[PDB]
Design a protein around this ligand. Structure first.
Ligand SMILES: [Cu+2]
Length: 76
């Protein structure tokens, strides 16, 4: 038992409104390693609270597509 938590921050694109933006994160929470998720669309950003041993980008990118969104990584 351990499972750390970390908070990523990333950009978003390809969206209707600051509401579907919630459902992507909230749906995304339902994957493994993820525990919370919070779209900070107030400043056009998204934050995802997950375990980066169990999750990573992988499941997130997979889901992001399926949810009908795309995120952008201007930070790396
Ligand atoms: Cu919407």
């Amino acid at each position: 038992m351990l499972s750390e938590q970390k908070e990523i921050a990333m950009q978003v694109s390809g969206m209707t409104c600051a509401a579907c933006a919630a459902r992507i994160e909230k749906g995304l929470k339902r994957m493994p390693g993820v525990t919370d998720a919070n779209v900070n669309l107030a400043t056009e950003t998204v934050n995802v609270i997950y375990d980066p041993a169990e999750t990573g980008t992988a499941a997130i990118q997979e889901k992001i597509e399926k949810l009908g969104y795309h995120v952008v990584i201007e930070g790396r």
